[PDB]
CSV table of C-alpha atoms and ligand atoms in Angstrom, one decimal:
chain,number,residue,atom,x,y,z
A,1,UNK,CA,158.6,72.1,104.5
A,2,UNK,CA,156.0,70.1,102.6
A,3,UNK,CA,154.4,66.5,102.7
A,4,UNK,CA,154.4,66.0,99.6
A,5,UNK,CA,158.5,66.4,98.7
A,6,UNK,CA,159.8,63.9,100.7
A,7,UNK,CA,163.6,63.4,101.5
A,8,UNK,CA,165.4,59.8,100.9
A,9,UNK,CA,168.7,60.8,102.0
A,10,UNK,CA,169.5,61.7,105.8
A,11,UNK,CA,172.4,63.1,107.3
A,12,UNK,CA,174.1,60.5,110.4
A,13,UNK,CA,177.3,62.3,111.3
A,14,UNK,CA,179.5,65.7,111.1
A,15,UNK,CA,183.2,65.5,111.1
A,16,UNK,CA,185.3,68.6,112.0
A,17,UNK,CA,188.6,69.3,110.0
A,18,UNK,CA,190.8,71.2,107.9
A,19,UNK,CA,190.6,72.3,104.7
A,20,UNK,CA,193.9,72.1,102.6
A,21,UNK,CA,194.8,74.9,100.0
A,22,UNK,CA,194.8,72.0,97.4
A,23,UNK,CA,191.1,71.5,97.8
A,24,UNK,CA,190.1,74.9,98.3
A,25,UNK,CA,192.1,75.9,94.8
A,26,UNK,CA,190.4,73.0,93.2
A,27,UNK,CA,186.7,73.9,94.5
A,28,UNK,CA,187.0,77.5,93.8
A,29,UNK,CA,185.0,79.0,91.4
A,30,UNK,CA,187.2,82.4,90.9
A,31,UNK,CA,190.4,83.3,92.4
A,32,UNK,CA,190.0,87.1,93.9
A,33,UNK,CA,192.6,89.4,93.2
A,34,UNK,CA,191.0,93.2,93.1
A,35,UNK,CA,190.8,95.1,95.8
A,36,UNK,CA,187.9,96.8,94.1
A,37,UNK,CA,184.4,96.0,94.1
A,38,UNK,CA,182.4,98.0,91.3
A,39,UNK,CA,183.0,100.1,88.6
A,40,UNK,CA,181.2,103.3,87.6
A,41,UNK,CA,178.4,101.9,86.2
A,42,UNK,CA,177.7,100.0,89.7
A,43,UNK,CA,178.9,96.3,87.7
A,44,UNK,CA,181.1,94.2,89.8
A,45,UNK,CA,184.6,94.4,88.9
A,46,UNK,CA,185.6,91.2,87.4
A,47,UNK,CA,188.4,89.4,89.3
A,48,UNK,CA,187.0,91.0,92.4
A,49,UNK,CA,184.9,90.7,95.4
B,1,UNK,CA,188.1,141.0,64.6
B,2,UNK,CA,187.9,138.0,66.5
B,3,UNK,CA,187.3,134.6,66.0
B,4,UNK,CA,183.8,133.7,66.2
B,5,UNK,CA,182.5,130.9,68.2
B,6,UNK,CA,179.9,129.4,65.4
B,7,UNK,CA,179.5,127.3,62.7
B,8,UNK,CA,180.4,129.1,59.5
B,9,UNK,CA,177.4,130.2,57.2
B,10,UNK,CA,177.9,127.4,54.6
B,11,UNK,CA,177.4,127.0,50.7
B,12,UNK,CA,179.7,129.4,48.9
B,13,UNK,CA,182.7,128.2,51.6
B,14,UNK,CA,181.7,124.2,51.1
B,15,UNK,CA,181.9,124.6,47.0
B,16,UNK,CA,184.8,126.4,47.0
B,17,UNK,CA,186.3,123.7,49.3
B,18,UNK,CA,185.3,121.2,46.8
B,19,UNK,CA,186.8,123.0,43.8
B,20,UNK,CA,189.7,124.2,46.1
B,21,UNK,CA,190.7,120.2,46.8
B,22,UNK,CA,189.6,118.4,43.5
B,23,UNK,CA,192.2,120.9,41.5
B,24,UNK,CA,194.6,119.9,44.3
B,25,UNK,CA,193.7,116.4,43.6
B,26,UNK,CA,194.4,116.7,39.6
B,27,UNK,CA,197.5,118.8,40.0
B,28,UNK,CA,198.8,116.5,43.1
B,29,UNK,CA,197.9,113.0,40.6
B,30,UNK,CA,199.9,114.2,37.7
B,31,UNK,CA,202.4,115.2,40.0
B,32,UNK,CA,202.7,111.5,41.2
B,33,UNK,CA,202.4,110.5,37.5
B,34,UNK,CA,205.2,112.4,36.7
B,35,UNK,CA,207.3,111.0,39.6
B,36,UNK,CA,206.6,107.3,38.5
B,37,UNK,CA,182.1,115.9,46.3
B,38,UNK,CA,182.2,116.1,50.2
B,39,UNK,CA,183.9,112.5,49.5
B,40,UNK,CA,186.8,113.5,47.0
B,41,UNK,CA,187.8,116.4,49.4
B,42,UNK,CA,187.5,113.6,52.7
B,43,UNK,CA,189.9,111.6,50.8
B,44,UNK,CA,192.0,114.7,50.0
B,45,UNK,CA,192.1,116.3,53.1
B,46,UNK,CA,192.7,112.5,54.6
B,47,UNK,CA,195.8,110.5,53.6
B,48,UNK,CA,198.0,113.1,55.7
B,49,UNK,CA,199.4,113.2,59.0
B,50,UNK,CA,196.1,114.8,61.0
B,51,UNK,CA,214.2,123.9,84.4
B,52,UNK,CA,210.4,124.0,83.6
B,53,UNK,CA,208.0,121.2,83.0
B,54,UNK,CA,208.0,121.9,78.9
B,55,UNK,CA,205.9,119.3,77.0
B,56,UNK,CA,209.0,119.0,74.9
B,57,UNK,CA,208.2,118.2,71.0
B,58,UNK,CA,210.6,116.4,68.9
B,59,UNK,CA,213.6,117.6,67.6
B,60,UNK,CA,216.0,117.3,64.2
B,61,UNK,CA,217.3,113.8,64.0
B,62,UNK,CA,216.7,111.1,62.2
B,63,UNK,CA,215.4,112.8,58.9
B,64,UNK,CA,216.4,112.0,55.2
B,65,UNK,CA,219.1,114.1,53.4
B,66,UNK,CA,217.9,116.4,50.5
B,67,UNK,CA,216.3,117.1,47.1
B,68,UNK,CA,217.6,119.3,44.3
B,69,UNK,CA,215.3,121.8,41.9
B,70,UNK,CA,212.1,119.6,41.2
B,71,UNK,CA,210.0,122.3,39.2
B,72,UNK,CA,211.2,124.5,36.5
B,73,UNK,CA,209.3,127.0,34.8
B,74,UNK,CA,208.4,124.7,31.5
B,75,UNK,CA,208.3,121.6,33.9
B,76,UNK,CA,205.7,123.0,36.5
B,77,UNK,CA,203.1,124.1,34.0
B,78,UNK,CA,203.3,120.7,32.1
B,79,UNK,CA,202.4,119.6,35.3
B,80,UNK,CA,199.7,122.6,35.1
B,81,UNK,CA,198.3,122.8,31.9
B,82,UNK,CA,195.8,119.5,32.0
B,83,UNK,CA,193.8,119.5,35.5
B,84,UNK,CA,193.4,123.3,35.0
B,85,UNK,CA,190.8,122.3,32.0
B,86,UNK,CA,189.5,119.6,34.1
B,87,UNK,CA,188.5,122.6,36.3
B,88,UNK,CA,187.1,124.0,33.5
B,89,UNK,CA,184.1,121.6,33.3
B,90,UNK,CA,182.5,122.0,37.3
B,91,UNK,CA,184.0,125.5,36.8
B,92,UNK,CA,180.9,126.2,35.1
B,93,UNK,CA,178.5,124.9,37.4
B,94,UNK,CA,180.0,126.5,40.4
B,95,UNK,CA,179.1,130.8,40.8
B,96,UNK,CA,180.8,133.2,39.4
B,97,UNK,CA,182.7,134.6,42.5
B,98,UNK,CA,183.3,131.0,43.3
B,99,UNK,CA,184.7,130.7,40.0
B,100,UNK,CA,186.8,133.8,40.7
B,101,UNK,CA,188.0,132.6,43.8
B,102,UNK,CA,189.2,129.0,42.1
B,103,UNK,CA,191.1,131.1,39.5
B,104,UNK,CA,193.2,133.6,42.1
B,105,UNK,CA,193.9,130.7,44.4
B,106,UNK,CA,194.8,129.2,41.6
B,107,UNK,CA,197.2,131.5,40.4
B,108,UNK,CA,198.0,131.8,43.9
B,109,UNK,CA,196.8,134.8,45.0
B,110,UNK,CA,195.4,135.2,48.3
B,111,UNK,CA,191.9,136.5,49.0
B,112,UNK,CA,191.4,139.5,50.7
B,113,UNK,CA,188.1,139.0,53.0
B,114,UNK,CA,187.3,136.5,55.4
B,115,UNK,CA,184.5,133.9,55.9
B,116,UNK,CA,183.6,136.0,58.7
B,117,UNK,CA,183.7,139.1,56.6
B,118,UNK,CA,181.7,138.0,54.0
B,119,UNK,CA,179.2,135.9,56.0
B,120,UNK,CA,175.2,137.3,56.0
B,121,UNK,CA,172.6,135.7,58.5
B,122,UNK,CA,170.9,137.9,61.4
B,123,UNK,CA,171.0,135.1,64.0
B,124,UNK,CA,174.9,134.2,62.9
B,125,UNK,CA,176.0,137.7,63.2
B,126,UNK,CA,174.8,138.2,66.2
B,127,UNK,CA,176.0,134.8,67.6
B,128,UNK,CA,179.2,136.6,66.2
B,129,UNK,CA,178.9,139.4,68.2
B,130,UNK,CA,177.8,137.4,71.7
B,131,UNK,CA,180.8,135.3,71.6
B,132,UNK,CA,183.4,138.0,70.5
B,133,UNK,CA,181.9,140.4,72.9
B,134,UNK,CA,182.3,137.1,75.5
B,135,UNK,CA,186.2,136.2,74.3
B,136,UNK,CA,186.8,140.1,74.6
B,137,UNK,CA,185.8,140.4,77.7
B,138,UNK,CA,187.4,137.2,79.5
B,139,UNK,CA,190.1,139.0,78.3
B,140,UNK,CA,189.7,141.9,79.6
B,141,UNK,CA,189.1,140.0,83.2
B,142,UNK,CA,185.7,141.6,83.2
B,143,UNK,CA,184.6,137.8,84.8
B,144,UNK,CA,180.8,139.7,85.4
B,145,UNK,CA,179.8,140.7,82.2
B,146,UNK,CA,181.9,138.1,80.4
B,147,UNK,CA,179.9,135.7,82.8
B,148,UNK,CA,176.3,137.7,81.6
B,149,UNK,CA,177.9,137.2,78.0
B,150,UNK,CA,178.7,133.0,78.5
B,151,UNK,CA,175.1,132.6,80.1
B,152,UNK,CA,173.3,134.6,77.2
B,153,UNK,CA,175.7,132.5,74.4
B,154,UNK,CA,174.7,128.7,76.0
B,155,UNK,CA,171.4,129.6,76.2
B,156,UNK,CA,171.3,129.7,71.9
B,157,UNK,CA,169.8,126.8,70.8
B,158,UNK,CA,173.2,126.6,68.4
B,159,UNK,CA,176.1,126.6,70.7
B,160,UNK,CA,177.6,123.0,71.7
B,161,UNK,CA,180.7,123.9,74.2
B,162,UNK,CA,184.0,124.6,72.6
B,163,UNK,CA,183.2,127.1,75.5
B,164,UNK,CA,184.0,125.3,78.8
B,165,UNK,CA,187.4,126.6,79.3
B,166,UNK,CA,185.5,130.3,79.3
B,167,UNK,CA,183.9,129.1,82.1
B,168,UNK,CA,186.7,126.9,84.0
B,169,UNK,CA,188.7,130.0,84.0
B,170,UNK,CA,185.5,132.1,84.4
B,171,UNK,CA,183.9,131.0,87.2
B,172,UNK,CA,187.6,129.8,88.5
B,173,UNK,CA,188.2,133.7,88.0
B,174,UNK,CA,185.1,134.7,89.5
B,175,UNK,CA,184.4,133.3,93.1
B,176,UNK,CA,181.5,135.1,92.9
B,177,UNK,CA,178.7,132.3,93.7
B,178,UNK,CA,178.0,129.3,91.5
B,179,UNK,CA,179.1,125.5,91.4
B,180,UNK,CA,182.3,126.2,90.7
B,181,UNK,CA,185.0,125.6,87.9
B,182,UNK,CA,185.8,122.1,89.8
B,183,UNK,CA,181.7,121.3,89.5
B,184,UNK,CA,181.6,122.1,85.8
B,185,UNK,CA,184.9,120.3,85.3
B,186,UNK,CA,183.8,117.0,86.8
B,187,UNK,CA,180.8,117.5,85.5
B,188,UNK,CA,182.1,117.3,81.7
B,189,UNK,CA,183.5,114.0,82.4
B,190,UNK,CA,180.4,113.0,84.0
B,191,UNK,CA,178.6,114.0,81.4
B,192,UNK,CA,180.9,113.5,78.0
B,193,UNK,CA,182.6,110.2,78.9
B,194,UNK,CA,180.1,107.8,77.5
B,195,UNK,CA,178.2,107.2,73.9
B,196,UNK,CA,174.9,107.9,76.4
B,197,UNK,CA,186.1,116.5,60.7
B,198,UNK,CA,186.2,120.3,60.7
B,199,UNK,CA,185.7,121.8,64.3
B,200,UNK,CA,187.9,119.5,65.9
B,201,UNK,CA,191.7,120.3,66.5
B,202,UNK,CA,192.9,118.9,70.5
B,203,UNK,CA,191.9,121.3,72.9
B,204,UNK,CA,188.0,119.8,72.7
B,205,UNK,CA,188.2,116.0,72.0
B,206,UNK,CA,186.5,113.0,72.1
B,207,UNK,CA,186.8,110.2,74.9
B,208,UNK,CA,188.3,107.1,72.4
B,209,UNK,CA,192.0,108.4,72.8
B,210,UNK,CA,193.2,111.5,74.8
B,211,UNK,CA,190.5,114.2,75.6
B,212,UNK,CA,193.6,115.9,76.8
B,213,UNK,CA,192.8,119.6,78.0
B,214,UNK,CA,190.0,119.8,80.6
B,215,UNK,CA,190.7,116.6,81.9
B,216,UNK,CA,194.4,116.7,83.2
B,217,UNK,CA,194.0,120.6,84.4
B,218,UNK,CA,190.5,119.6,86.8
B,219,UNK,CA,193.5,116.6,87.4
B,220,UNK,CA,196.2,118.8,88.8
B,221,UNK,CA,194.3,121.6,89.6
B,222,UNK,CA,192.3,119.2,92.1
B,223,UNK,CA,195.0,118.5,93.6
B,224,UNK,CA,196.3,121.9,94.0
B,225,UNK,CA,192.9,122.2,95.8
B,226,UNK,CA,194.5,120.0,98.3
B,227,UNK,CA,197.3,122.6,98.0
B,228,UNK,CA,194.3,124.1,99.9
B,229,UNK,CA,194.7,121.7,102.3
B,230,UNK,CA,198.1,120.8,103.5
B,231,UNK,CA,190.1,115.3,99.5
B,232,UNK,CA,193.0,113.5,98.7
B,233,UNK,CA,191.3,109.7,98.8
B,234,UNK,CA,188.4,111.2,96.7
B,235,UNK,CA,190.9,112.6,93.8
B,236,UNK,CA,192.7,109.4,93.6
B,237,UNK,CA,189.6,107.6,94.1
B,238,UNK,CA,187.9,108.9,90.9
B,239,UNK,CA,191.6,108.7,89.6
B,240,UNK,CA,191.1,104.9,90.4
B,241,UNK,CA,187.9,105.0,89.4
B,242,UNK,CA,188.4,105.5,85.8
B,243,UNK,CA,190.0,102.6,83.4
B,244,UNK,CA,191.9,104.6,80.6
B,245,UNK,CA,195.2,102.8,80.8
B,246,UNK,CA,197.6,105.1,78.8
B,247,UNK,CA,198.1,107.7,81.5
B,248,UNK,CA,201.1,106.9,84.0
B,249,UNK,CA,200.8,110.8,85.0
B,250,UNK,CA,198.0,109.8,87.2
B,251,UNK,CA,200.5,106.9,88.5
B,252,UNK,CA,202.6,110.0,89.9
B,253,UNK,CA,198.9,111.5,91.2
B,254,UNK,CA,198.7,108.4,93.0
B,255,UNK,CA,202.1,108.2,94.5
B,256,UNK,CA,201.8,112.0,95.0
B,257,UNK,CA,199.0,111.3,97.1
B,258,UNK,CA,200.8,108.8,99.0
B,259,UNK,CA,203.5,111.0,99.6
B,260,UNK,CA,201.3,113.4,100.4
B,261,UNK,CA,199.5,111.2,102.9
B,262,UNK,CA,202.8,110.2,104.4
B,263,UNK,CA,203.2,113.9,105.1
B,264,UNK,CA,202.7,104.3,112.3
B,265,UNK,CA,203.0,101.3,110.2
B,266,UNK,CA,200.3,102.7,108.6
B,267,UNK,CA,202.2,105.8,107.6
B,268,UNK,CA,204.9,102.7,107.0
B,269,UNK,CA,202.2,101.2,104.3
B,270,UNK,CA,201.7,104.9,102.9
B,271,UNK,CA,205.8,104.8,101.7
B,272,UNK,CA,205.9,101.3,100.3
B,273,UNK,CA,202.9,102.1,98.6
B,274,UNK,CA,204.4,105.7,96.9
B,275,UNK,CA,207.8,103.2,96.5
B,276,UNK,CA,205.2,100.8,94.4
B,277,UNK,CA,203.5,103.5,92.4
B,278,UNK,CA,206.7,105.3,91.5
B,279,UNK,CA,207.8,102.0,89.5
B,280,UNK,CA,204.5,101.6,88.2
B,281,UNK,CA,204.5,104.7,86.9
B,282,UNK,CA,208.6,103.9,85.0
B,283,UNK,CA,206.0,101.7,83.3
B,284,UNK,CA,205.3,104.5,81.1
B,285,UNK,CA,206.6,107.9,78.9
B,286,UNK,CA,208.3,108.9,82.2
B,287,UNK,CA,207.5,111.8,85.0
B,288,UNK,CA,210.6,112.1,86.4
B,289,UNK,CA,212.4,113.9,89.2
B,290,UNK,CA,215.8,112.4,90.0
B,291,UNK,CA,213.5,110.6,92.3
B,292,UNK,CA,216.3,109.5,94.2
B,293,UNK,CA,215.3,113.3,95.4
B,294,UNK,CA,211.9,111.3,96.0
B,295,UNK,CA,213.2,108.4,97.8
B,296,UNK,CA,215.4,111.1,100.1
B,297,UNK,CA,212.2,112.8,101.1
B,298,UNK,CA,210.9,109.2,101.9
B,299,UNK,CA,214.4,108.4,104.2
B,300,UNK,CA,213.3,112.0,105.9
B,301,UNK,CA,210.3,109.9,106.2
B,302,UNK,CA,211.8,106.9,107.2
B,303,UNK,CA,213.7,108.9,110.4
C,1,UNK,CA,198.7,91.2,98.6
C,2,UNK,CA,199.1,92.8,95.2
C,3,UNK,CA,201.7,94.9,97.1
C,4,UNK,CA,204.0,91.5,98.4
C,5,UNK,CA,203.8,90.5,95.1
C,6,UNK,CA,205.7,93.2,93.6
C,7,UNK,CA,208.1,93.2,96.8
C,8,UNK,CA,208.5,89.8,95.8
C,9,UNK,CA,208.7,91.2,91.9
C,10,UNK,CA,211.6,93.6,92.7
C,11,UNK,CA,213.3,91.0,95.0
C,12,UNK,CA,214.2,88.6,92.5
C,13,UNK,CA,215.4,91.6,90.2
C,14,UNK,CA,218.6,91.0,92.0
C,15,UNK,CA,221.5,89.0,91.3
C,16,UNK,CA,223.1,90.5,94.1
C,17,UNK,CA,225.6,88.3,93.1
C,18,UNK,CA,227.0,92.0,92.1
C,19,UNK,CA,224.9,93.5,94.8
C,20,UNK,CA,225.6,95.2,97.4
C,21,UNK,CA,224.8,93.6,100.9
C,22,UNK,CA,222.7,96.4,102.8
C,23,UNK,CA,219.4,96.7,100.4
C,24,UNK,CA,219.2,92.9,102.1
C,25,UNK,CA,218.2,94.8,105.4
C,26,UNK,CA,215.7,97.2,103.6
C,27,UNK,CA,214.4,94.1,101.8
C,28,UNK,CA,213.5,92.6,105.0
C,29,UNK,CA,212.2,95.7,106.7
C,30,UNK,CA,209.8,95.8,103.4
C,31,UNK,CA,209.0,92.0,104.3
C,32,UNK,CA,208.2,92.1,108.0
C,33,UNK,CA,206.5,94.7,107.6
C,34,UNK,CA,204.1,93.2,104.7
C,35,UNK,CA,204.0,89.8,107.1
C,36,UNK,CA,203.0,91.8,110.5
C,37,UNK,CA,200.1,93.9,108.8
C,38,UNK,CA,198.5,91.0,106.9
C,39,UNK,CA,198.7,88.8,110.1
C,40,UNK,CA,197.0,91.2,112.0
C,41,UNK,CA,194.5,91.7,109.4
C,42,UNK,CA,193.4,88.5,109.9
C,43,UNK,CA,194.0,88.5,113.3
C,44,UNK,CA,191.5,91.1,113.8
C,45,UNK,CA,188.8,89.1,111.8
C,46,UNK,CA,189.7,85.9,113.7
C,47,UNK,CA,189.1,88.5,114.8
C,48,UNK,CA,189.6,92.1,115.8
C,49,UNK,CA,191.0,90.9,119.3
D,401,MG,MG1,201.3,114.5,59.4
């Protein structure tokens, strides 16, 4: 936190819900589908976690 | 009187293969004709094909009829007569035994000695000897000395490893002490499976398409090493491990060791997963018990 | 979920308009099997209680 990079925009409220599998599909970045992690040169598998 | 396990002592043998292939080449045109350097023997040698569990080969079907008398006496040496003086011109650059040895091949005699028997360097000769006196001995199951003999021969600043089966076998053989055939197997695929022509027919390969061999016996014979046990989870995790899609046998690896792991949902998940892998593996050049033989061993799982 | 969706693969591979009945009772033993270990999967995250 510093004095000299102020904020302008301030949060006034949090609302608790449900996130639909249409927005999560659109937000996503990658869909996951190996179960996998890394190969044998220690690079993430692509498609995975 | 065995073959040696060295480089063949070179110039006389490498002219000869050029004079040996570029008379092929003129005899082989006109030939064509009639019908209608390293380089010129690459191109030669190139354009050119190059109840128990039997790696069947394939049979008489599907081949084309006939032919009928192509070469008479008068015919064949028109085809002769012209690339024979051809070979006269390099003829006379090449030496005199080499010259020799282009005319009885060329009648089509046979020569009577070797490139062993005729093969001169100290070092050579006696790499000659090491590895002889090594195959002799693995054959003679005389693992100790043929293990003093392997150990003396890889120390030789000359000897890449055709050898490894020697040892696989060797030290499999042997029981004596050291990292054993398994640890030398895995570790030629640890080493040879990442960039980090004459001596090569199948049984020593390179890792674009099949290194066949050394790979698939440390394969099964891993897994007879779990014969040892009923490790399983590690074999078919370094089966998962590596991406070289054109297998399928190690699709029946995997649902072996899912059968073998099935020997309680759990177990459950172990048979659909052997049911998965089974198809998965009738995705390719098939393995195949009736397997409905497989699927009854799963139903005396299923009880 | 890789492995529903080759249950799921094989499943439509009928007709069984030809078909006879019974694989419809190994079918579903396949299914409520897949359903009961990925709900308790998540169960146990949500929560390993
Ligand atoms: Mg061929």
């Amino acid at each position: 936190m510093d004095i000299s990079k102020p904020v302008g925009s301030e949060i006034t409220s949090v609302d608790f819900g449900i996130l639909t599998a249409k927005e999560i599909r659109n937000l996503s970045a990658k869909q996951i589908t190996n179960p996998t992690v890394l190969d044998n040169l220690g690079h993430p598998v692509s498609g995975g976690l | 009187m065995f073959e040696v396990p060295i480089t063949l002592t070179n110039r006389k043998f490498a002219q000869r293969r050029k004079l040996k292939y570029q008379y092929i080449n003129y005899i082989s045109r006109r030939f064509d004709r009639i019908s209608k350097q390293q380089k010129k023997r690459r191109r030669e040698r190139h354009w050119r094909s190059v109840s128990f569990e039997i790696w069947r080969t394939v049979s008489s079907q599907n081949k084309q009829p006939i032919n009928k008398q192509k070469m008479t006496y008068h015919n064949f040496k028109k085809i002769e007569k012209i690339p024979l003086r051809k070979m006269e011109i390099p003829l006379l650059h090449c030496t005199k035994e080499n010259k020799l040895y282009f005319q009885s091949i060329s009648r089509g005699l046979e020569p009577l000695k070797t490139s062993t028997s005729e093969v001169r360097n100290y070092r050579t000769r006696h790499i000659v000897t090491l590895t002889d006196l090594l195959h002799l001995n693995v054959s003679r199951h005389n693992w100790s000395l043929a293990y003093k003999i392997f150990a003396t021969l890889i120390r030789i600043p000359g000897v890449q490893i055709k050898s490894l089966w020697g040892i696989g076998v060797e030290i499999l053989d042997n029981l004596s002490n050291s990292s054993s055939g398994l640890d030398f197997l895995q570790w030629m695929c640890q080493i040879y499976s990442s960039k980090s022509r004459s001596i090569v027919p199948p049984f020593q390969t390179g890792s674009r398409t099949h290194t066949a061999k050394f790979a698939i016996t440390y394969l099964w014979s891993s897994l007879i090493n779990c014969q040892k046990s009923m490790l399983i989870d590690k074999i078919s995790e370094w089966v998962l491990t590596p991406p070289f899609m054109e297998d399928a046998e190690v699709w029946f690896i995997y649902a072996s060791c899912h059968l073998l792991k099935a020997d309680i949902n759990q177990v459950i998940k172990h048979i659909h997963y052997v049911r998965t892998f089974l198809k998965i593996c009738l995705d390719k050049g098939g393995f195949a018990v009736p397997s409905r033989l497989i699927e009854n061993q799963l139903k005396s799982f299923e009880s | 979920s890789l492995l529903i969706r080759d249950l799921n693969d094989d499943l439509s591979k009928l007709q069984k308009d030809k078909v006879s009945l019974e694989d419809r009772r190994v079918i579903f033993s396949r299914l409520m099997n897949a359903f009961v270990t990925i709900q308790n999967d998540v169960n146990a995250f949500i929560d390993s209680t």
